[PDB]
Structures are given as C-alpha cells and as structure tokens.
Write a protein that binds this ligand. Sequence first.
Ligand SMILES: [Mg+2]
Lengths: 110, 117, 56, 120
Amino acid sequence: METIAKHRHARSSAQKVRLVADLIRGKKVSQALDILTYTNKKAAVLVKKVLESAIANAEHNDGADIDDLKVTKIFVDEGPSMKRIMPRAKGRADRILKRTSHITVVVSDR
Amino acid sequence: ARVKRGVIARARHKKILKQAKGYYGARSRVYRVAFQAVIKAGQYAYRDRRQRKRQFRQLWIARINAAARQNGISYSKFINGLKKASVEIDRKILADIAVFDKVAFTALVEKAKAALA
Amino acid sequence: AVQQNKPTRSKRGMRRSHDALTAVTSLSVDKTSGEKHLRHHITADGYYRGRKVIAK
Amino acid sequence: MRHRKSGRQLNRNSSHRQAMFRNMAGSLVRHEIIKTTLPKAKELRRVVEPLITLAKTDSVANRRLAFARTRDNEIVAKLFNELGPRFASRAGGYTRILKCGFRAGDNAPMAYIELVDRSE
RNA sequence: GGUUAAGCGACUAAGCGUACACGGUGGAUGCCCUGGCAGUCAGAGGCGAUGAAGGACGUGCUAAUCUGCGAUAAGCGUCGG
RNA sequence: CCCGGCGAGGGGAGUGAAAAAGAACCUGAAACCGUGUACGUACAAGCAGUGGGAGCACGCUUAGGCGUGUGACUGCGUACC
RNA sequence: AGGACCGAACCGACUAAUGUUGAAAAAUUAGCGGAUGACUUGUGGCUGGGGGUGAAAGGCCAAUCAAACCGGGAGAUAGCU
RNA sequence: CGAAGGUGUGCUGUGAGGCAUGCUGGAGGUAUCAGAAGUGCGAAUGCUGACAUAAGUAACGAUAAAGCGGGUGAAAAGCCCGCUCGCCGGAAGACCAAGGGUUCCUGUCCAACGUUAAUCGGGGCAGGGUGAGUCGACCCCUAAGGCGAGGCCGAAAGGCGU
Ligand SMILES: [Mg+2]
C-alpha cells in the first residue's frame, strides 16, 4: 500500500531541492539512501531526512517488505515566502524574497 | 445599489480562454493575449472559409490536368471538348473519377477529343 | 544591458537542461566491514584498505 | 600561464603562505596527525619531508638551520631525537594523505595527513 | 538459405510544446456581521476653581494589554429592583 | 505511537457529520510553479494562427471510415489601443 | 612682533584613479592649501518666507529654494495629453 | 434526497447569452412581469495584493591573516579552551559629556534576524544586576537670551518693556 511523507515550509529554494529530487526518482531505496547521504548539498540532507521519515512510516505503520520498497513519486512544491527589505545604494530599497518549499515523497512496495 | 463584476468578468474570461484553448504558452493562459489570438483566429477562419474553395479547385484542376496528360491532351483542350460536348460535370467529380476510375476518365477523354473535331 | 521582451518558461527550462546534477553509481565496497564509501576515501569509522587509519 | 610552474597560491600572499605553512608544519610534527584540505597537505609535504630529511643528520649547524624554520625550540628538540632514528632508514615518503570526505560548513575536500608509523 | 551492392526506414528525448488528471504559493468569487453611512421620532443642547476636557503613574492571587477606579485605588456607605 | 535533533515537520490512532474543517483552519478561481499519462519535436527559419491533412493512443460502435488528445507536411497570413 | 615659513591634531576639498542599481542619496586611496588667527570647535539663545541670512553664488534656510514645509480655498484652471 | 459559488461536458440561439448534468462545495437562491443603477474593462508611464523575468547571475559590504589539538553539540572554518601567525597600539586602548534606554550578567532555545554553517550573539524567554553629606544632578546667583504684574502702543489677536 502507498505511504506518503512530506516536509513543509523547508527553508530552501524549490529549484535547488528539485535539482536533487530528480536524482532518486524511481530508483531503489537501498541505493537512493546511499546517493542522498553522499551528495554534498543541504537539500540532499533535507530530502534524505524526509526519505528516512517515509521509510520509517512504511514499517511502523505498514506491514513488511522493506527491501523491495521503492520510491514512486517525488516532487517539490513552492511554499509561502517571506518579504524582507534589503537596503541598496542611493537610498533605494529592494524587496528580497526568501522561498520555502514543500518536499513530498511517495513510496510503496509496488 | 453597488454591483459586483466578479462573476460576469470571470465568466467572460473563462469563455475567452475556452475559445483559445491550446495555441502556445501565454496565448492559452493570458487573457490579454488570448483575446487577440481569438480575434486573429476568427479573421483567419473567415478568410479561409473562402480560401478553401479556391485551394480545392486548384487541387482538382491539377489532378484533372495530370489525368488528361497521361491520356495525351492538355487541360484546356479537354475542357473545350467537354464544353463542346454539352457536358456539365463539375471539376470535383471529374477529379474523383480520374483518381478512382481510370476507364471512366478514358471514356471522358475520347468523348472530348471526338467533340473537338 | 537589459531585456527587451520577457523570456518564456520554455526558455528557462531549456537553459536548465545542462544544469542537472550527476549521481555517483559505484562509490566503493569495503573488503573488511562492507560499507559504502567514496573512492580513495576512508569510511565513516576510518577504514581504508582493510586496516584502521584514524584510531578514533 | 603555468608552463612547468609549481607552487600553489592558496589565495594568500607570500608572507601569509609562509607563515601558515610554518604553523601547519609545526602542528603536524607536534601531533603527527592533521586534518586539512588536499592542496594544503600536498604543499605541506614539500615543506615537511625536506625538513625531516634535514633533521636526519644531527649537528649544531643543522639544528640552527632547522630552528630557522618553524621558529620553535621545542619543535627542533623533538626533531633530531624522535623522528630521526625512526626515519633514518627511510628514503622519502615520510607523510601520507588519507581523504575523509568534505566539510559541512563550506564543502571543502577534507583529508587526514600523518607519518609512516607514528609509533602507535 | 548465405555473401555483396543499391534504395527506403521508424523505434532515442538531454529538454521542450500541446490536452487531461493530481498537487503547492496565491486569497478573488459565494454566504454572514455586537462595523459603518444617511434619515425619522424625543431628550440634551454644554463642562469646569466645590478644580473641566484630556493625559502620566499606580490599583487583581498578576507578567503584559484593554476596561473600571484612584493609596478607601476591576473600588466603599445608604436606599430601591 | 513512530520518525525526526528531548526541534520544526510528517505519518498513524482517536474526537469530530466532515481533519479534501488541524489552529497558516468556510467556500478556494486565475496569474505562477511541478508530477504522471497520450502525441509531436535533435535538417529546420519569421505575430506561431487558420484550411487541408497522413500518422499516433483511448472510448465508441459490436463493424459502418465517429469523437476526443497531438499534429509530419502544405497554401495563406508582418499583435492590440 | 608678524593677518611671517615648513610641518602634526584640526579645517576645506585643488589634481588623478575607483565607484555611478557603490561601502556612501558626493565617499575612499594617492597627492594638496591653511594650520596664532579675517582660525576652528562644544554648549545655549536670537534673526521665520516677498521674509531671514548672505567676504555676494540671486547661494542656504532640515538630503529642496528665481520665493521652505504643513493644512485650507481646491475636485483652483488647462482651447492640452 | 443538497442553495449560492467554483471547476468540466453536452445541447441551444444572428449575439450579448440560456438550459441540463458529472465533481467539489455545504446554505441560501429565485420564475414571469414592472422600477432604480456605484450595471458590463484591455490599455489611461491607472491604484491595491499576489506571482514570473534577468537567475540561482551579480553580490555576500576596505587585500589587518588564519591554522592546529581537545571539549559541548546530531551536525564546528565561524562556539569555548590551550599553542602559534598577523594588526592597532596620540588607537582599532581606557574613562566621560551629548545621545541611546537594559543593548549589562546568568540559565535556557534556534520559531524570525546576523547578507553562509550555528550549538554563538547587541536574537526569543525567565531571573538578577544600578547602594552617595564628600561624584554629578538638585539648590544660591548670573551673561547671551526668554517671560513679564503695573505701563506704553496697537481693529482684535497681539508687540515692547519696569
Ligand atoms: Mg490551463
């Protein structure tokens, strides 16, 4: 049966996390975890934590078959953003954008 | 009494986007471009409603000329013979016959040739 | 220098084709503890070529 | 444009480069185990291994020349007595580099560097 | 059936475009109002050196705010419901 | 209860008519950002549409050349105020 | 003794470079002049808009000045866009 | 036994449109006929809010300079300790006035901030901290200057002044 876990309002850009999400889409969990834990990006650590949470969700809440478990759907969606003011030259002010992301991983044995 | 335009404008926008569903990018998403795309498509459809008859007439005349040329006669001579033979077959049926029925077009061509003399 | 027309999302995603990250496939297999590690690198517990290298 | 040229820049001038090479080499010879970046250790080799080779022979002139480097009396005292006999029968290759991944702060290539045996 | 030569030739999508389905930021639209706006019927049309209007500071079992009050300090006495 | 950092966040169980009502909480569109499906695209030039149109996939129908989704190529076509 | 000289603190900005969505709504670096006097600075007060002040540029009067700012006439007027 | 609204499909009209229905939605809507508009948006360098673009590019804010070992910590180039290297040192040191108004110390945490990591902080929460006959303020007096009973002047307001 399908298991869904997600992380909301993560302090990271959507594009940066999506650059890492495409690396493990459809891959085996056993190798996906190894790829995530040996990738030198903060978004890689975040998606590794989310994947570990999903894996734990697939054994404490689900029956069995951890070895054949495979990630099926992974996607990153942009979340609410924070508006901040960054002073610039000649008294000009620029509205800087801090983007949050919703990282959702969908995993099932099939 | 105050009147809110949030429903009629939304309905008009939805209708316009429906009329221009799937041209390219913003043309199928942005109303400000969708309206111009709809107007241009309507103008093109109006022009082609008349252009189609001319294009199909050109296709039919090309096919009839080719069919007459395999039989050893030009299109103009074939039409002159048909007119002299009191034959009022439109070029669409002539092209259909030439494409599908070879012997029928052969019979038409010798009748035109005989009417020429 | 500044833009004259707004680039479309097609151009944005078309530029990002070469920005995809590359993923390792065959990091290593330890001959003593059998744990994955980088090529020519020590493991988490400082194991390389079978013999301990860090002594914690 | 670097035709048969050697000597890394390390984003530092000559004085700072020499000073931090000296401090790093002193720390290494004191502790026999240092974790640093790959280029830093690679350039450390070309300073420490010649220092060990110089320390292989013990004399007042050699000791003074060694003291001219590392600017430390205790560092020279440890030399010519401990690492001398240990590396007396060794011709080069006194140091080795073991990569250990990357830092979590700036993602820089990390590697441990140590002596041959370390008597441990 | 095999060798040779000529002609034809899709099945590849790093990415993109189109339609559909499922999602995210986004808070318009729909419904509601101890909120406003304009009037009608009546009162009042002023308060105050017996210290005005308006404020500061304190007052609870109180750390803060609103409200009430003023060292008798979210109050006291009398008479009625 | 579990993961997670004795976090944040998430998934279960339960209350709840409803949790596709979870405190960022009624209804939740568009611009914008994605995932999967079907089609086309790596020798082709331009207001990107229109008419024709082979082909490709699915529902038809129990055949009947139907519709939907895309559009190889082709004639014409230099936005709006 | 010098409205004397060189030259620090201090005052000012004559020359060159950087900057021109900068570190800065006029600065920094290298040079420069005055530097015991017509000097500079701290503190407090006064001169308030057809006015003030001005070793005099029609300069300044709160990052503005051939008539400051705030509110009212005022939804000034526009044969203009 | 499903109102408005939203989202699709089909039918229909010379058209602004109308009707039916699938799903969401979960409570009002309203036939026909007459009347009144804050009654129909694509532009006005229109206003408000949200979201693309350059792009994950510049930049991360004086070229005085960091390194090593250990410790806390899940995570240390940035926190603490010890060793060095360098800088200021008529200052980049110390004490005050003006100003700021708890930014001071301790314990605790990374929701937001620091142009990055964060366990750190001038960040959040709680507690504590300021002791004057000799310091200063207060007070006596006074300059520049301000107010100013009587008084003078001036339509009023008000100005000058003992
Ligand atoms: Mg759409």
